[PDB]
Design a protein around this ligand. Structure first.
Ligand SMILES: *C(=O)C(CC)(CC)C(=O)Nc1cc(CN2CCN(Cc3ccc(Br)cc3)CC2)cc(CN2CCN(Cc3ccc(Br)cc3)CC2)c1
Ligand SMILES: *C(=O)C(CC)(CC)C(=O)Nc1cc(CN2CCN(Cc3ccc(Br)cc3)CC2)cc(CN2CCN(Cc3ccc(Br)cc3)CC2)c1
Ligand SMILES: [Cl-]
Ligand SMILES: [Cl-]
Ligand code: NA
Ligand code: NA
Lengths: 807, 807
């Protein structure tokens, strides 16, 4: 077996090769249709049953905007119907990321650039046949308005954030009122570190929560003829949180001081504000919710009788679903005389209600699944929730909880015990089960059909390489019925009326498609669900000829799990020759790289590496996503210690199976946790790995945030050895004494993994007498430079003939 | 002619080679004896005429401290007397950079670490024969005290800076009093940006002025029996000066707002403070000193009748020597009623006195030469000054100026004209002349013998490669007499009594020596000066065998100047072979690299390069030091444009003269302006230069300070093209498209040439699609890493066989 050497291109020739083969900019295709919504026409004489609204990007150099399409009552089943995209909005006098809608009025609300706009379609006023003009919500606010939301109780009112405070605005009367006076934009960021209605850094970055306020969905009527609207909101104080060059709670240090507040808004009979009463909790947040760090999720019950909240402790091993009555809130009064009367006036029976609680030795994984049924009995609440805590796989559970009067009484003048607010669980039926998970993140949710008493959900039952749509009953659970076709992975939106679903689907060979599917039952059994192809929304471009996709492989690991991987064979594969191998890696939690999805957009350059004569390998090691909580928990307290074993094991599996892998010329490369592991690979296994290109590596776990690090590694005092061994900066001495094996890539203004990680690693590498190569990216045309430098670095120090002579 | 290839050592082998050959740490030898002072014994029966005091480092791992040595009345001229070093101070209960002394009391004052200390020797109390105990000046000041100075009028009092304010302290009574209340350490650096008695950044960095206050050398007696002491001081406001991550006035932006203040200190008959009156100028600084940016130098006349100051304009093309009477200062009064009486009470004849003024089209070069003779007539002042403005070479001039009453009268209530304070010049004799300069920087000054009416000075008369001591009359100037021996460069201290001088001397082959020389006249002519070797103070270690020094060469440049250089021939020079060449460069103003001095300490690694088989070249291009103002002015408004022409010219001179220079493998390398020029070399002349290693390069002249940039390049608006063409960051497109030719080295916390220069160059290189290599030094063991990486980089991309195959 002779070694294959890649063609030694010049820097200009590589720049040319990259530019000629490039087809997407910023690793981004035009946004496929998303954020679907079905509205019924209700026109017996007309040809259409529904109108669907959705956000999409019409072309490559185009802005994301609202379109609609017509769903016909019948179809020509010999033909294939391609639904035409009708633009909902007219061109402006600036792209839309999301939108709101109020079923009963037709009112859309959305932000596009600086403006907040609205239109009407599909309410009482009917359905347009031409693009509507977006109506600007006018303002006297100087700065950009963020996070607009329609009030579901009254579609004339909206709320939004401006300079970290909550405002409301009427789109008909033009009235505009500030609700919170927590932040003062004249005062500096060190003194005034408070905010209302806004999720702080860790909650956005690590818990995927981007909003901090929620409208009450119903309006309390007043005797006068007017009403009371309500906004539940989070209020954060970040004074004690560490500063960096904004507020970044690094692991071990303080998180924000948080609480719930409520804004009570009296409107008169003609939509004019009478008064605004800002209301705080009756007792402090620390007393009523013992041991809670993070407000993970929040909202209201369907009838708006209670506010709900999913709450976590600092260790992220205890979740609590807690109902909060509006009566727990009293007006803010710095006068202690009036305040004391308000505390005593609120009943003792009015108390927080912990309707659910769960624990784990691994960690809680927050998701977006939580459905509350209409309240039939006064002293019971019925909901569906998902959890990994019973069986180690995320499954749906229907839970009924009893709303007891609490044993703790506030009149006694003491503090409540740890479990005085715990509601008894009457019932707890398992809706799904097995060695597979329900998906509750990244758009995956559930659609509950309350009529037929079913629940649609996404899951990994057929395969961990494919997401599929399933349906099952929630009263008499049993037969789980797959609705999506095997051989693709699916991301699905189900109509609110539960008679259609859309699926965005792909596999390794075929690009993304979006298609509409009609749902129906057989006449003999309404429980049984079948689907029929109705129409195409987005048609695939087809298997483009210049991308050769990889093969999914697997191997039985000595760890006792099947580990999956991807293999890009070199193009023009020569007989009796061995090729240099690049291992692309991420390897951290909450990500799966290996599945039956199209990888020719984001990872197109793994194919480009294969075209030059590199074997490219990717392996989902233990800790990675979609394999259950036990598989994920493998590296608890042990980050860095187990990942490379699985990579090396999978690499040796391929070497014995394929003679064309040259194990003497193996490189490794990743970004973020991938960069971290690329450093760990060269440190621990320099026998295996010739070169490591670490992009934006975590080098020091004490420099990363609370929400992420503490979930997987705990508090630093309780894991002194894990933090030391897991931090590559502390082990600089263990890097190679050869140069041309280590390359560090990092941006200067990266606010996720700070440059500090790279610079402190550089600091200790220099003190340890070790060589490194470095590229920096200070503050479009630089993804070009990165790709260029990477090909050149691999060529010069791994792939080419010159590289072998260099050692 | 076959190419020689350097031995390809591994990274570990290079680290070993560097460690084995290393003999100094941080490019620093132990400090040779400096800051000399001669005190007469005045003991007719005893064997010694003088005691000399001086600062020195006794060994390598040792602190800089005060020693003394005994100068005998006679010597054994057959033998060579090596003076023993006697320690002046005892070990403490922490090194000394400088000291003060009060002739008439014996009082030394010095800072060592945090403490300010004092001892006595050589006054009325006599001469110790054993180490004295340093006496701590006690304090209630919390923070470190800076810049201590004895009051020459009263050796009981000192002054010092504490938290940017001037304090005084009595070393006998222990009284301690704050004089200025300008800075408040509780208030932050953005709000309170004021300071007193302290030179701001640009004055320290670019004008070598480190102090901002000066004691009046005489004490005004009061009727009571007490007296008045005076401190002239600079007061700076840096509010409008730009901030960076301290106050850095970048070119084009505002410098500090400056003025003169005076502290008047009434002491009673027993050394106790009665009162302290803080006094400001009668009219603003901007009115009295029209067009002055920088207070370059300041002090007092010998009798203390006037304060003096050397003042510059923003362009640094107009110097003014200005006398300032204490009567120009009035007490500070925010009450306008009392203030108005004080303004009218001061006479109109009391006015600033511009005793000298000069201009140039090139630039003024500040120096430390300024001697004022005792005032014989009431309306005349007599002084020696040095200047390049008459002839383009720095020469000494004796000037007599007439102290006129000013035509401008303050009672009129108008502002003064541009030239109303100009004093008529009665006389202006040239003391020296020719195509050579007097030296007035870096310790070089003049010693004026007022008895014999001579002046000792350092100069370049015998050679621009050697500094020498000369003497000449200042009444009847003529025969300039060299006192130092040819074949060495000399740095000299002359005794205050003008009967001895010490010289620290070296040449290319022999390390530094320090020797004492006795001065005397022939009996027939007191004007004629001769010298005799008296004793050795520091003996040279001798030509150490592992350093081969370079040869000084020269060549007649087409520019019309003789340009000098240094050549390190490769060791073990083989016949009929050509060697790779490294050009070491600085090339900026105010530096000369090429002279007859020992280069085996600071530039020892140029020899180490020669030992591996590199030709090392150094060339003093136009703009560099010690060749006159015309030679220096060559690159005015044109930095970057002319330097590399001279380097390439000198390189081609050597190539035609020596066949062993391989012009196909020429590298360039420098730090600071050298790094800047290394970038300019690869940009302009990639035909000549294969590789460029730029250390801490200036890449953008608008990012550098006012004092330096504007002196050589003017204000950016008046030189738009020079700034653009001189800034390498703006011309990233002109760098090579080949990799392995450009290497950038920069510290992260460099506060002279900021990292910003490198990062913005990196920014534009990435946008231009250009390759670079980078090493960073974030925040002893790293000069090791730099040297290691440089040898390896030259080896891999210039010197070795692998480097030639790589292209
Ligand atoms: C990790 O999670 C983070 C996101 C938080 C970093 C902490 C991450 O994913 N980073 C990441 C970085 C890059 C590199 N780009 C960063 C931005 N930079 C902009 C810029 C602007 C101005 C200047 Br002067 C310089 C730079 C451009 C560079 C890229 C990616 C995306 N992945 C890269 C790897 N890729 C596979 C692959 C493999 C081989 C080759 Br050749 C090409 C691609 C998958 C996507 C993420
Ligand atoms: C230019 O004027 C400046 C001073 C203001 C820079 C703007 C300059 O002279 N710089 C300069 C830098 C170095 C390099 N050292 C910088 C400090 N650094 C400390 C450090 C601490 C912690 C860490 Br983690 C990293 C780094 C160490 C590196 C050196 C010098 C001195 N000259 C170097 C060149 N030398 C000749 C020479 C030639 C070849 C070889 Br091999 C070795 C030496 C002359 C002295 C100045
Ligand atoms: Cl079941
Ligand atoms: Cl003369
Ligand atoms: Na996120
Ligand atoms: Na200086």
């Amino acid at each position: 077996l002779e070694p294959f050497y890649v063609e030694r291109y010049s820097w200009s020739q590589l720049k040319k090769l990259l530019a000629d083969t490039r087809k997407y900019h910023g690793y981004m295709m035009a946004k496929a249709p998303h954020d679907f919504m079905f509205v019924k026409r209700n026109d017996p004489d007309g040809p259409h049953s529904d109108r669907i609204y959705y956000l999409a990007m019409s072309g490559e150099n185009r802005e994301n905007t609202l379109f609609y399409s017509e769903i016909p009552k019948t179809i020509n089943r010999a033909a294939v119907l391609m639904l035409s995209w009708k633009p909902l909005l007219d061109l402006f006098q600036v792209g839309i990321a999301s939108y709101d809608y109020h079923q009963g009025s037709g009112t859309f609300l959305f932000q596009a650039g600086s403006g907040i706009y609205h239109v009407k379609d599909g309410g009482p006023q009917g359905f347009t046949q031409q693009p509507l003009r977006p109506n600007l919500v006018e303002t006297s606010c100087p700065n950009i308005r963020m996070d607009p939301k329609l009030c579901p109780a009254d579609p004339d009112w909206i709320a939004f954030i401006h300079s970290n405070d909550i405002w409301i605005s009427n789109i008909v009367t033009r009235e505009e009122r500030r609700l919170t006076y927590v932040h003062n934009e004249l005062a500096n960021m060190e003194e005034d570190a408070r905010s209302a209605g806004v999720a702080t850094f860790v909650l956005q970055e690590e818990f995927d929560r981007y909003s901090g306020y929620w409208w009450c969905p119903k309006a309390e009527t007043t005797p006068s003829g007017g009403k009371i609207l309500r906004i539940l909101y989070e209020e954060n104080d970040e004074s004690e949180v560490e500063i960096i060059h904004f507020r970044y709670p690094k692991t071990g240090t303080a998180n924000p001081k948080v609480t719930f507040k409520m804004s009570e808004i009296m409107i008169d009979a003609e939509g004019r504000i009478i008064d605004v009463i800002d209301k705080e909790l009756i007792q402090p947040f620390e007393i009523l919710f013992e041991g809670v760090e993070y407000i993970a999720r929040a909202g209201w019950t369907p009838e708006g009788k209670y506010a709900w909240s999913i709450l976590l402790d600092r260790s992220q091993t205890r979740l609590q679903i807690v109902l909060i009555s509006p009566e727990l809130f009293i007006p803010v009064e710095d006068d202690v005389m009036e305040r004391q009367r308000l505390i005593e006036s609120v009943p003792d029976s009015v108390t927080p209600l912990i309707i659910y609680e769960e624990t784990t030795d691994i960690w809680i994984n927050i998701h977006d699944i939580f459905h509350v049924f209409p309240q039939s009995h006064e002293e019971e609440i019925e909901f569906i929730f998902a959890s990994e805590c019973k069986t180690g796989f995320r499954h749906l559970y229907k839970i009924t909880s009893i709303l007891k009067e609490s044993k703790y009484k506030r009149s006694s003048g003491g503090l409540p015990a740890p479990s005085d607010f715990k509601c008894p669980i009457k019932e707890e039926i398992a809706i799904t089960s097995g060695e597979w998970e329900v998906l509750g993140r990244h758009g995956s949710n559930i659609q509950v059909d309350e009529v037929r008493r079913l629940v649609y959900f996404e899951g990994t039952k057929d395969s961990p390489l494919e997401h599929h749509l399933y349906v099952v009953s929630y009263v008499n659970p049993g037969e789980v019925t797959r609705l999506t076709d095997r051989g693709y992975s699916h991301s699905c939106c189900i109509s609110q009326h539960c008679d259609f679903f859309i699926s965005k689907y792909s596999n390794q060979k075929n690009p993304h498609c979006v298609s509409l599917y009609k749902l129906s039952s057989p006449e003999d059994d309404p429980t049984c669900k079948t689907k029929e192809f109705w129409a195409t929304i987005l048609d695939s471009a087809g298997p483009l000829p210049d991308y050769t996709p990889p093969e999914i492989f697997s191997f039985e690991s000595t760890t006792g799990f099947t580990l999956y991987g991807m293999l890009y064979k070199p193009h023009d594969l020569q007989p009796g020759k061995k090729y240099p191998t690049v291992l692309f890696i991420y390897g951290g939690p909450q990500v799966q790289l290996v599945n039956n999805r199209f990888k020719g957009v984001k990872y197109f350059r793994l194919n480009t590496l294969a075209s030059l004569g590199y074997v490219v390998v990717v392996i989902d090691n233990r800790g990675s996503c979609h394999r259950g909580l036990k598989f994920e928990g493998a590296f608890k307290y042990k980050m860095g210690q187990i990942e490379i074993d699985d990579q090396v094991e999978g690499l040796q599996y391929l070497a014995s199976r394929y003679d064309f892998i040259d194990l003497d010329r193996v490189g490794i490369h990743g970004w973020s946790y991938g960069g971290y592991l690329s450093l760990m690979a060269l440190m621990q296994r320099s026998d295996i790995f010739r070169v490591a290109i670490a992009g934006a590596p975590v080098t020091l776990w004490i420099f990363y945030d609370t929400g992420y690090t503490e979930r997987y590694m705990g508090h630093p005092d309780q894991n002194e050895q894990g933090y030391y061994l897991g931090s590559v900066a502390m082990q600089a001495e263990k890097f190679p004494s050869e140069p041309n094996r280590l390359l560090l890539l990092h941006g200067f203004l990266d606010e996720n993994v700070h440059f500090a990680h790279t610079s402190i690693l550089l600091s200790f590498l220099v003190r340890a007498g070790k060589p490194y190569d470095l590229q920096i990216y200070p503050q479009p045309e630089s993804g070009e430079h990165y790709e260029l430098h990477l090909l050149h670095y691999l060529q010069e120090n791994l792939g080419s003939r010159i590289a072998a002579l260099k050692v």
